[PDB]
């Protein structure tokens, strides 16, 4: 309960009179109450690392012992709140202090202790019902979209002897008093869970449903699933926040720059979404974790664990969370400097030896689960990491030890950026290992797409092993089946994998229109191949350069598929246009032969 | 045996990372297992790291997050880490520590074997003789694996080496013209490839051959180091005491060495070359050299390690030392995976250094030597014509360089291309291999001698 500072030495504090102190448990160092973490016991002393600036901490300062490690507050009031990497609400320290600064040792509640929430019990409990860890006993109308479900803590069970009457409550009163055998206890409306502990589940279901990202590339050739893990080495993350099939977004910037973090907090309360014809601010179904590089280095490493623990909490209600964890490589640079303070031996380029263990302890909390509780729920957490290598390599220990863990790699390069292509998709080092899990969704609902996806990845590959000779030799003595797979292959690279994100046709790409565009482009490839191979020996052998001059008006309708608006036009107004065009592609070849 | 009761200390002198250091210990053994129980009740396990007089440094497996030096009880065992082996564990799925995860019961032991293992007497080895038939044509036709060979599969991240390993395990057997088993160790896997391995082998009907050790990525990095030693002590019971032929597949041995580098640096050791431990050559050798046939027993162990080369580097010390102890390589290639070929196995760099003893008459068939090096020459001469055709065009190639480009369109799509469920037996990877060698006349096949050209070409 009481320690004393025996000696500080930089951000590491040695405390005495700490006999029963646990590892990684929280302490309040100093007279200003700096939050710390016990990292090394030696007998009755306790080496503490301080989560704040240590200047002015004398010896003989009191060290309060709490009994609980670094943990977040879970409850109603989270959605819309701007937190820190140790969950300090930055939109309320700016009010209760009325300054531009974060003073040392602030103790602001992470959830507000003044807002009255409308409690609604689950109408199937009573005074004398049996309830165990995970059973929903309340519903809070947090805002219009989120039905905030109150849940029992895991490893807590018994019989209810007090349920709270439906009304309006704050997050401090005693809403639930169930009893275990002999001992009565009390539950509030907020719960507290340690950020390095996995929130428990019943079973981990396979991730078999596609995460609809709003784009044409990355959703046909390299698909992601609900419950999957990606890597992006803001137009891919802002697109998922408006249109995708996720009900809670969690944006976690670990060590991002100050002006690029003040950019996002300016932009998200202006964004809108389309729910039922009404427009709604997207800051009703997201919560950010703001963290810059001026912040404590101990609160930058913990921002990833706070972000996924917040992400796992809204999973258990039954929502499908999608967490974007921006700048994973900044998070590893927080692991490099903690390990240097401990005098830990580095393994690879100064990074600790456990860089892969900590990343697999974060990326493997994603996935579709069967949620712990009574009403048979099902939620999921998608994690979208973002490695920033030192100039686009797989040599650093952060980029290469992410690709040994994740399943999707949305591999981007810097050379393929000045084409004004936008995205900077590479499609040679980018993969997706959710092609075998999605062989049931594609074959049942879409039943045609896997052989077109097999061909369309091949046409863009045969172009590569031609293009080195097309540069050096230059199209002089070439076969005519290769001129198909350079002009049809060019038609893909400007009309299928080409985007521009502020336009009224290319901010959402629905998937039935996405397979509708490839249903014509592969058919034009195979009919150009079947023409050139059966008319290779008989009489009046043709090349490509007699077709593209003759069928110049066919190559305009096959190039004006990306410019049809998916938003103004009808749902069936776009497939018939792609089904009428096929008979302008089946009859058109029968005008040459 | 060990009939004395066990001491349960609560004299913890400190915690420093994953190390718990006790004091006033009565005669502590080295590498002895302890069982820590936390204040709240969570039982964790750990292994003794260093003894010094009355001290003991214990490396807790599941971390030290919640251990205090006042109320933690650390019960010593007195015996080192051993496994229970049985023949009825063929058909189970264990994790890295050896506990079942297939809703199964605990394995009733026939023996308790020390998992570190003793080396084999080098006089008591026999040279590998017969063939292990995998079912993949690219490693049975031209890169054949003996009985007792150690041949690693070299690949990279993103490449489908994990489905090659699952297709070997479904179809591995003998070379038929009751004693075959497979011990599949999976180190450093994620969840979505752990339920690929757990689901593929159990509903493709051949779970009864395979004993699956699945060590996850989120599981402790010490439990990844005892995973290939649990799998090889099971294989050394099943083969050298039950006379089975065992195939030992170790998946992603570059993930063993990333957990060995992590366990070494958390033991407060100083790293060696490229950050890896200095004893990395004699640490893989304790795994790889648990193989081969033995004198006086009818079993064998053939190993197939699998590697992931970072940045396609070969001078990295995980492929450097694997190619230094093991005999050949397989070389899953990236330029074939982008062209949609399964399995994407490159032939030109791959090699089996004991392939000339696993083939022949009375082992596979008489022409398996002369077919394989003939398809190897025509695969190389075609791939020069494949690049040369782009330089000069099609109108400048003769009726010689068209036989090699028409063979090359059918060697990659019929010999290399297999599909994941098509078990080509080795008698059918030669008839595939002959009906590509009929695109050429008998005046062109230089690598085949004329006596077997008369017996196998005209059909």
């Amino acid at each position: 309960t009481f320690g004393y500072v025996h000696g500080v030495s930089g951000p590491v504090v040695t405390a005495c009179d700490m006999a029963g102190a646990a590892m990684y448990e929280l302490v309040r160092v100093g007279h200003s109450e700096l939050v710390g973490e016990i990292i090394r016991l030696e007998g009755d002393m306790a080496t503490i690392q301080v989560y704040e600036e240590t200047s002015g901490v004398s010896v003989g300062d009191p060290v309060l012992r709490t009994g609980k490690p670094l943990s977040v507050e879970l409850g109603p009031g989270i959605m819309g709140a701007i937190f820190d990497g140790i969950q300090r609400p930055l939109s309320d320290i700016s009010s209760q202090t009325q300054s531009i600064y974060i003073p040392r040792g602030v103790n602001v509640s992470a959830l507000s202790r003044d807002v009255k929430w409308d409690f609604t019990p689950c109408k199937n409990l009573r005074v004398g019902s049996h309830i165990t860890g995970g059973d929903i006993y309340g519903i809070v109308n947090e805002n219009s979209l989120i039905k905030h479900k109150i849940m029992l803590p895991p490893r807590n069970r018994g019989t209810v002897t007090y349920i709270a009457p439906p009304g309006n409550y704050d997050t401090s009163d005693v809403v639930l008093e169930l009893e275990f055998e002999g001992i009565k206890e009390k539950f509030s409306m907020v719960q507290v869970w340690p950020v390095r502990q996995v929130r428990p589940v019943t079973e981990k279901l396979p991730a078999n449903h596609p995460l609809l990202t709003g784009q044409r590339v990355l959703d046909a050739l390299f698909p992601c699933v609900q419950g999957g893990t990606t890597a992006i080495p803001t137009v891919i993350s802002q697109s998922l926040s408006k249109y995708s099939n996720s009900d809670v977004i969690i944006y976690v910037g670990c060590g991002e720059r100050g002006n690029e973090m003040s950019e996002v907090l300016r932009d998200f309360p202006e964004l809108t979404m389309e729910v039922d014809g009404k427009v709604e601010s997207i800051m009703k179904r997201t919560a950010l974790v703001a963290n810059t590089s001026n912040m404590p280095v101990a609160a930058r490493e913990a921002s990833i664990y706070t972000g996924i623990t917040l992400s796992e909490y809204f999973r258990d209600m039954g929502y499908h969370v999608s967490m974007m964890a921006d700048s994973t490589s900044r998070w590893a640079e927080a692991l490099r400097e903690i390990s240097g303070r401990l005098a830990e031996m580095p393994a690879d380029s100064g990074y600790p030896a456990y860089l892969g263990a900590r990343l697999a302890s974060f990326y493997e909390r994603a996935g579709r689960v069967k949620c712990l509780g009574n009403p048979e729920r099902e939620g999921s957490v998608s994690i979208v990491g973002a490695v920033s290598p030192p100039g686009g390599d797989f040599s650093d220990p952060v980029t290469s030890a992410t690709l040994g863990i994740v399943q999707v790699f949305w591999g981007l390069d810097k050379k393929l950026a000045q084409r004004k292509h936008f995205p900077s998709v590479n499609w040679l080092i980018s993969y997706s290992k959710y092609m075998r899990a999605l062989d049931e969704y594609y074959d049942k609902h879409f039943t045609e797409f896997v052989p077109l996806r097999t061909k369309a990845k091949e046409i863009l590959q045969e172009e590569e092993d031609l293009a080195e000779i097309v540069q050096l030799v230059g199209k002089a003595s070439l076969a005519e089946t290769d001129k198909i797979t350079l002009e049809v292959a060019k038609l893909i690279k400007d009309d299928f994998l080409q985007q521009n994100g502020y336009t009224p046709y290319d901010r959402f790409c629905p998937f039935y229109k996405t397979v509708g565009m490839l249903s014509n482009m592969i058919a034009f490839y195979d009919m150009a191949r079947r023409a050139v191979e059966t008319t290779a020996q008989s009489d009046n052998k043709i090349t490509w350069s007699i077709i593209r001059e003759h069928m110049g008006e066919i190559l305009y309708k096959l190039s004006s598929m990306k410019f049809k608006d998916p938003v103004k036009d009808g749902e069936a107004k776009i497939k018939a246009d792609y089904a009428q065009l096929l008979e302008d592609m089946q009859n058109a070849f029968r005008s040459l032969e | 045996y060990l009939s004395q009761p066990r001491l349960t200390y609560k004299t913890v002198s400190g915690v420093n990372g994953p190390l718990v250091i006790l004091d006033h210990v009565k005669f502590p053994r080295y590498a002895e297992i302890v069982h820590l129980t936390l204040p709240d009740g969570t039982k964790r396990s750990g292994q003794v790291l260093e003894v010094s007089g009355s001290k003991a440094v214990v490396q807790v497996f599941e971390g030290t997050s919640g251990i205090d030096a006042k109320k933690t009880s650390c019960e010593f065992t007195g015996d080192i880490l051993r496994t229970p082996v049985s023949e009825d564990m063929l058909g189970r799925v264990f994790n890295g520590s050896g506990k079942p995860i297939d809703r199964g019961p605990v394995v009733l032991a026939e023996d308790f074997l020390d998992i570190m293992g003793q080396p084999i007497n080098p006089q008591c080895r026999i040279y590998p003789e017969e063939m292990i038939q995998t079912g993949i044509s690219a490693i049975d036709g031209m890169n054949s694996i003996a009985r007792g060979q150690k041949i690693p599969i070299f690949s990279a991240a993103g490449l489908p080496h994990n489905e090659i390993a699952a297709q070997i395990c479904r179809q591995a057997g003998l070379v038929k013209k009751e004693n075959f088993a497979i011990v599949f160790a999976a180190m450093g896997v994620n969840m979505e490839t752990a339920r690929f391995f757990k689901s593929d082998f159990e509903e493709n009907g051949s779970m009864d051959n395979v004993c699956l050790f699945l060590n996850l990525a989120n599981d402790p990095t010490i439990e990844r180091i005892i995973t290939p030693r649990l799998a090889l002590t099971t294989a050394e019971f099943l083969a050298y005491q039950c006379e089975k032929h065992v195939l030992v597949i170790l998946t992603d041995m570059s993930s063993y060495a990333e957990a060995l580098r992590e366990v070494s640096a958390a033991r407060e050791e100083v790293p060696g070359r490229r950050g890896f431990p200095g004893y990395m050559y004699t640490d893989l050798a304790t795994i790889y050299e648990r193989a081969g046939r033995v004198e006086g027993r009818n079993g064998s162990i053939t190993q197939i390690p699998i590697l992931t080369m970072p940045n396609d580097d070969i001078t990295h010390p995980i492929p450097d030392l694997t190619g230094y102890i093991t005999e050949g390589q397989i070389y899953v290639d990236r330029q074939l995976h982008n062209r949609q070929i399964y399995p994407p196995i490159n032939v030109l760099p791959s090699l089996s250094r004991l392939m000339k003893s696993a083939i022949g008459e009375g082992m596979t068939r008489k022409d398996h030597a002369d077919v394989s090096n003939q398809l190897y020459a025509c695969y190389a001469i075609g791939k020069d014509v494949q690049a040369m055709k782009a330089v000069v065009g099609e109108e400048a190639l003769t009726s010689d360089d068209l036989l090699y480009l028409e063979f090359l369109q059918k060697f990659e799509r019929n010999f290399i291309a297999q599909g994941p469920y098509e078990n080509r037996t080795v008698y059918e990877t030669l008839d595939i291999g002959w009906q590509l060698l009929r695109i050429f006349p008998k005046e062109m096949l230089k690598r085949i001698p004329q006596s077997t050209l008369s017996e196998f070409y005209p059909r």
């Binding site: 005098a343 031996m345 580095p346 | 407060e268 100083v270 790293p271």
Partner: peptide, 18 residues
């Protein structure tokens, strides 16, 4: 190599004092 070794003996000097 030497600098990570030299900080280890300084931890041993700190522990034989106690």
């Amino acid at each position: 190599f030497y600098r990570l070794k030299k900080i280890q003996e300084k931890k041993k000097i700190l522990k034989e004092k106690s």
